[PDB]
Design a protein around this ligand. Structure first.
Ligand SMILES: [K+]
Ligand SMILES: [K+]
Ligand SMILES: [K+]
Ligand SMILES: [K+]
Ligand SMILES: [K+]
Ligand SMILES: [K+]
Ligand SMILES: [Mg+2]
Ligand SMILES: [Mg+2]
Ligand SMILES: [Mg+2]
Ligand SMILES: [Mg+2]
Ligand SMILES: [Mg+2]
Ligand SMILES: [Mg+2]
Ligand SMILES: [Mg+2]
Ligand SMILES: [Mg+2]
Ligand SMILES: [Mg+2]
Ligand SMILES: [Mg+2]
Ligand SMILES: [Mg+2]
Ligand SMILES: [Mg+2]
Ligand SMILES: [Mg+2]
Ligand SMILES: [Mg+2]
Ligand SMILES: [Mg+2]
Ligand SMILES: [Mg+2]
Lengths: 132, 101, 138, 313
RNA sequence: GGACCUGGCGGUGCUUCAUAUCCCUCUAGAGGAGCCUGUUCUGUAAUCGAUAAACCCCGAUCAACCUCACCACCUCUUGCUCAGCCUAUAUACCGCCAUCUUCAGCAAACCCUGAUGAAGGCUACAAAGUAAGCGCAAGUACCCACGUAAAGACGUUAGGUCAAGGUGUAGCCC
């Protein structure tokens, strides 16, 4: 039986998001990609470097906004601009979200030597697609 | 802070191979022709053999950069099949999807 | 009501140096998503028409790179997982535009290149014969 | 996820305001903005390449989006509105009661283009869930109603449960007859066999000459079976030595190229034969594109179908 | 010990079937020769894992050094790391899988039957079942609506993998 990236059926009490509810074979069919860049196009270079950067930013944001992320990050690269789009919860005070945005954008801009912007969308609670 | 001691040895091999690349390239040029005297090429053979063993680029191994797996690595992403699939199967590799045809 | 009264316009200076002439600009965009290329095509074509540039469009054949990987962490060789990367193309062909017009149009459409889309713009410049080649010295 | 009437009423107010916003975004008249324009604008503003269209961005009217919900079936006093409520299938059994009642009244008084609706379409007219045997029993009762001397009132009713099906004619299409600079009538067609692609020009009048990539057909096809394929279309309609052909073929092997030319010539030849002859060519297999193409090899097996040897145990 | 329920099993009955499939039938092979390659044995101071179906060009889309985890000898001790360990345990596990599956079943919550026992719950000219959800199906990919892919639940074999990585427990620390 296939296991990869499959949230398994339970008793009907486990809330899953839309991202979680779709196995890998639905990628490009029902669900899109969580990062968009040119490295994996034919004739393009530096796919390995974009992949390492993406893995770091996901770990970095998980621990920089601990308990606040309500879904996976969406990573967008245009030119040398890096856009991080995150769906977060509404528990932390707005002052802390502004501190962490200023801190994260600045720290990541100096780390990867590119202008980095963080876009936060807040939701009252994790959006539930279905109960498995 | 590298994944293991085996990745750390390969890191050092890549650094030393980079430092000796020009010297080895120049000495090899003397050995890779039929123009120069054998007396001169025999000395160049000994000179390149006397360089540090880990300066030799054939000892560099393409290991998985996140797990240090020495085989099953995809060169384009520098990841092992297991690590690559984990990212691909979660939709985190731009443009990569399951193939059906 | 709270509208600006006068607006400062960016300074565009006419030079004394002659302008570059491009016989053709072949803008080849590559992407994983056809709908994004369709939307970019619409934007890029509409931008050319407003600027008075002659533009033709076609879709080169797509490229699909497939590769195979083991499914299990250990053994079970006969069970594989196959992956692919789809590269789709749209080619915007612009003709008979000066170097100043090409700089504005390319900057306008390059800045608005969607995430995940690469562009290869091939520029064909018109040049006159070098003065040394006009006559034989011998 | 039940949806109340107040919820749908709010969703329609949002769609009408958003419909004017979307028209304002695209610089179009909000009054003449149709659903086809909405879909076009949403596809541009939110381009999605997802293969399944149902997963793509959509801005539809609430009636189209939300499922049909049955209204409450009893009032404040708790009395159900319909006398068949306690069956659990009041809509289905009310229909069976209405059809059974009509069959009785008739006694007291005394195909190609249409089909019966499927169970999933009846389940929407009734807004109830039905078994398969429930569907059959209802159809068996409607068929029993056609066999009777049903009048006009009993015919509008049966037509509600009939869905028009658009039969597609198998009649072969005919290419236009064109004329060259010299005024010679000719037709042009194309054919595909495996990876070979052919384009043939069949002239109305000729001596039987066939040129394949500028070469005589017997020099281009030295194998006699490839030449029999070229003979097959003309021989079948008794027109050997009556037409000139100039065709071009690329891709595939010698046999696939002969097949692609055979199909291209047969389609183009249909312009110069009678309609009855075109139907005989169709029924002889001369106008059908062969769909048989190489099957991909699968991983973990030796070929497209062959498996690796099952190792001796 | 008596009588039952459920499951398994029967060189168990009847009936109907299998569709590259059980027999017969069709085509090309293996089993014989040499060679290539894996494994087992034997050998070596000199790895490990897989190992009936479901191991055996298997982890390896790959070992002359390296890789390397093995052996012999020599050397270092806060050590690339706010150490390290391919040390034991896959019968503690996550992760990713094999297998039936070339299946269509799994099942919450209720309701009813059996005197309110383990348990059981269907007959359409219908007799107690209603069933969310999951799977199949449907959709999607490839050249169609075909085919092939993909998908394939709950469970089964304490199946495979602590040597991808991570990790519980135990153990090593000149
Ligand atoms: K039994
Ligand atoms: K044999
Ligand atoms: K053999
Ligand atoms: K396991
Ligand atoms: K492990
Ligand atoms: K362990
Ligand atoms: Mg499988
Ligand atoms: Mg090597
Ligand atoms: Mg074969
Ligand atoms: Mg057989
Ligand atoms: Mg043999
Ligand atoms: Mg062994
Ligand atoms: Mg063993
Ligand atoms: Mg074992
Ligand atoms: Mg050694
Ligand atoms: Mg060795
Ligand atoms: Mg050790
Ligand atoms: Mg186990
Ligand atoms: Mg299909
Ligand atoms: Mg399959
Ligand atoms: Mg399916
Ligand atoms: Mg075991």
């Amino acid at each position: 039986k296939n296991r990869a990236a499959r949230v398994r059926v339970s008793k009907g009490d486990k809330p899953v998001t839309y991202e979680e509810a779709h196995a890998p074979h639905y990628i490009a069919h029902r669900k899109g990609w969580l990062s968009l860049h040119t490295g994996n196009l034919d004739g393009e270079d530096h796919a390995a470097e974009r992949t390492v950067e993406d893995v770091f930013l996901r770990k970095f944001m998980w621990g920089t906004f601990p308990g606040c992320l309500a879904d996976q990050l969406v990573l967008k690269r245009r030119g040398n601009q890096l856009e991080i789009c995150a769906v977060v919860l509404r528990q932390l005070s707005p002052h802390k979200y502004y501190f962490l945005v200023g801190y994260s954008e600045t720290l990541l801009s100096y780390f990867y030597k590119c202008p980095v912007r963080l876009h936060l969308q807040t939701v009252p609670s994790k959006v539930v697609y279905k109960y498995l | 802070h590298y994944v293991d001691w085996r990745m750390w040895r390969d890191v050092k091999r890549r650094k030393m191979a980079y430092e000796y690349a020009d010297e080895r390239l120049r000495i090899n040029s003397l050995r890779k022709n039929t123009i120069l005297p054998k007396i001169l090429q025999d000395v160049a053979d000994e000179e390149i053999a006397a360089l540090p063993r880990d300066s030799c680029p054939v000892r560099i191994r393409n290991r998985c950069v996140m797990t240090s797996r020495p085989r099953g690595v995809k060169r384009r992403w520098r990841l092992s099949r297991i690590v690559f699939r984990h990212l691909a199967d979660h939709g985190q590799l731009s443009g990569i999807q399951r193939a059906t045809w | 009501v709270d509208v600006p009264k006068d607006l400062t316009k960016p300074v565009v200076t006419i030079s004394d140096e002659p302008d570059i002439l491009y016989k053709r600009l072949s803008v080849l965009v590559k992407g994983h998503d056809k709908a994004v290329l369709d939307s970019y095509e619409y934007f890029a074509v509409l931008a050319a028409k407003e600027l008075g540039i002659s533009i033709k469009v076609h879709e080169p054949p797509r490229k699909i790179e497939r590769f195979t990987l083991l499914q299990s962490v250990h053994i079970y060789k006969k069970h594989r997982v196959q992956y692919e990367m789809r590269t789709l193309y749209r080619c915007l062909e612009l003709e008979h535009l000066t170097g100043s017009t090409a700089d504005v149009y390319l900057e306008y459409i390059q800045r608005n290149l969607p995430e995940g889309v690469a562009m290869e713009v091939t520029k064909t410049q018109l040049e006159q014969l070098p003065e040394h080649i006009k006559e034989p010295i011998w | 996820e039940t949806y109340t009437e107040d919820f749908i009423k709010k969703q329609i107010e949002e769609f009408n305001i958003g419909k004017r916003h979307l028209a304002n975004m695209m610089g179009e008249d909000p009054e003449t903005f149709t659903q086809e324009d909405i879909d076009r604008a949403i596809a541009y503003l939110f381009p999605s390449g997802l293969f399944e269209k149902r997963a793509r961005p959509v801005m539809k009217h609430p009636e189209q989006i939300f499922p049909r919900q049955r209204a409450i079936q009893w009032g404040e006093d708790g009395r159900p509105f319909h006398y068949l409520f306690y069956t659990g299938k009041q809509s289905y059994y009310s229909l069976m009661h209405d059809v059974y009642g009509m069959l009785l009244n008739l006694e007291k008084h005394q195909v190609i283009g249409s089909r019966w609706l499927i169970k999933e379409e009846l389940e929407e007219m009734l807004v109830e869930k039905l078994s398969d045997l429930d569907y059959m029993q209802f159809i068996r009762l409607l068929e029993k109603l056609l066999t009777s001397q049903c009048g006009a009132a009993e015919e509008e009713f049966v037509q509600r449960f009939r869905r028009s099906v658009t039969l597609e004619s198998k009649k072969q299409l005919i290419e236009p007859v064109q004329y060259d600079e010299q005024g010679m009538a000719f037709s042009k067609s194309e054919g595909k066999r495996k990876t070979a692609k052919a384009e043939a020009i069949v002239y109305k009048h000729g001596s039987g000459r066939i040129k394949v990539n500028g070469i005589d057909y017997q020099l281009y096809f030295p194998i006699t079976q490839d030449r029999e394929q070229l003979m097959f279309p003309f021989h079948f309609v008794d027109r050997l030595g009556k037409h000139d052909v100039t065709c071009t073929v690329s891709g595939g092997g010698r046999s696939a190229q002969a097949g692609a030319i055979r199909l291209a010539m047969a389609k183009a030849l249909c312009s110069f034969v009678t309609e009855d002859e075109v139907e005989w060519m169709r029924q002889a297999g001369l106008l059908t594109t062969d769909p048989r193409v190489r099957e991909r090899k699968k991983p973990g097996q030796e070929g497209a179908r062959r498996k690796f040897t099952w190792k001796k145990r």
